[PDB]
Amino acid sequence: ESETLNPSARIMTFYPTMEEFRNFSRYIAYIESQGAHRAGLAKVVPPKEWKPRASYDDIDDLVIPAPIQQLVTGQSGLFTQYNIQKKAMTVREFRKIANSDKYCTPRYSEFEELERKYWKNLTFNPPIYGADVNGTLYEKHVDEWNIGRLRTILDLVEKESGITIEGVNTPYLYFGMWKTSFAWHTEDMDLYSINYLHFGEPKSWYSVPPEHGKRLERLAKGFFPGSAQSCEAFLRHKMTLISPLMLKKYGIPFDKVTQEAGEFMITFPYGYHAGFNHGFNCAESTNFATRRWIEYGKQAVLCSCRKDMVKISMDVFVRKFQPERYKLWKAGKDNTVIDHTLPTPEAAE
Ligand SMILES: O=C(O)c1ccnc(-c2cn[nH]n2)c1
Ligand code: NI
Ligand SMILES: [Zn+2]
């Protein structure tokens, strides 16, 4: 039944009405009832009626406390990205650098051309990314899909322990320029993410279906045996770039999609994704959860080589939503096998 929905595991695109848009978790359950999650990634175009902010005309004074310069080393589709933190910088300061001749977007016809230039010039002329900036650009009154307060069960982490995890249960802003990249990865604890492109040039995405996620990991371990030896989940470092041609060459299924300003992207549990920004832009994102995520959370394979990595206690989720398995899980005997095709329980409504 779930297997017969989106059997291609293709990236789907949704155009909700304004009435459908009002209840966030309900629409996530809906697009899962249509098999969107099998792709790992889905686009959701909100009604023209909607806007999270009246104008972006005041933000040139907003500070980017830790701009990152992205050095990239590699060849023939395989790359490792190193981060060089620059000194703090305002948005107007950043836009100036980004729109300057040295860093601006090259001219091109179709997207496949800009794509080709991206993978051709990835290692040259290191751009700067205004990444992981704590904040939101939603006006305080917007209630539909407000990244600052989605009200999903991920809120249970803060409710129970008081713990905030920047960018995970709090929002991050991302100021991009041409050729700034996000490496191949899943979310922390294999959560969902929501990404909103407030303004600027597009952001292109690659996705690998969760049901093929393990195939991508085997390939990545093969190409980076050193990194694999020293960490059980090195892709969570978010340093590893792999071109779509390399994926084709080794039979990994994937899809691609380009995100325009004013569009949402949803990534799903264990959905590997990567991509790049076309030019100057601004994006807001955070993580969230559904009842389906819990099993993913229990089984997420985490980065083993840093003490500073994101680790969420699953205990309170298992107690509340899987009480009959708590004794078993806590005794390490819960061998529930995940079916990636199944939609989340809430989609019964
Ligand atoms: O750089 C982005 O726009 C982006 C896109 C997709 N994922 C992330 C990200 C950063 N940490 N977890 N996920 C960042
Ligand atoms: Ni992500
Ligand atoms: Zn690690």
Numbering used by the authors: 4 to 352
Original authors' sentences:
The introduction of Nε-methyl lysine methylation marks is catalysed by histone methyl transferases and their removal is catalysed by histone lysine demethylases (KDMs). Human KDMs are classified into two families according to their mechanisms; the lysine specific KDMs (KDM1A and B) which employ flavin adenine dinucleotide (FAD) as a cofactor and the 2-oxoglutarate (2OG) dependent KDMs, the JumonjiC (JmjC) KDMs,3 which are part of the wider 2OG oxygenase superfamily and which use 2OG and molecular oxygen as cofactors. The JmjC KDMs are grouped into five subfamilies (KDM2/7, KDM3, KDM4, KDM5 and KDM6).6 They have conserved 2OG and Fe(ii) binding sites, the precise nature of which are subfamily specific. The different members of the JmjC KDM family accept different substrates (typically methylated lysine residues on the N-terminal tails of histone H3, H4 and to a lesser extent H1);8 selectivity is mainly engendered through differences in the substrate binding pockets and by the presence of other recognition domains in addition to the JmjC domain.
In order to find selective inhibitors of JmjC KDMs, a new scaffold was designed based on the 2,2′-bipyridine series wherein one of the pyridine rings was replaced with a triazole ring (e.g. compound 14a) to give a different potential iron binding motif. It was proposed that the triazole-N atom would be able to coordinate the catalytic iron atom and readily enable alternative vectors for compound elaboration. Replacing the pyridine ring with the 1,2,3-triazole ring resulted in a greater than ten-fold reduction in potency for KDM3A, 4C, 4E, 5C and 6B, but a less than two-fold reduction in potency for KDM2A and 4A. Although compound 14a is very small (MW 190.2) it shows a preference for KDM2A and 4A/C. This is likely to be due to residue differences in the active site of the different JmjC KDMs. Although it was not possible to crystallise compound 14a with KDM2A it was co-crystallised with KDM4A as a surrogate. KDM2A and KDM4A have similar substrates and are both able to demethylate H3K36me2.8 The co-crystal structure of compound 14a confirmed that a representative of the triazolopyridine series occupies the 2OG binding site in KDM4A and provided insights to inform the design of KDM2A selective inhibitors. The triazolopyridine scaffold itself does not extend substantially into the substrate pocket. However we anticipated that through the introduction of appropriate substituents on the triazole ring at N-1 and C-5, the activity and selectivity for KDM2A could be improved by making interactions in the substrate pocket. A co-crystal structure of the simplest example 14a with KDM4A demonstrated that it binds to the JmjC KDMs via active site metal chelation. A new KDM inhibitor scaffold has been discovered through the incorporation of an alternative triazole metal binding motif to the known 2,2′-bipyridine-4-carboxylate scaffold.
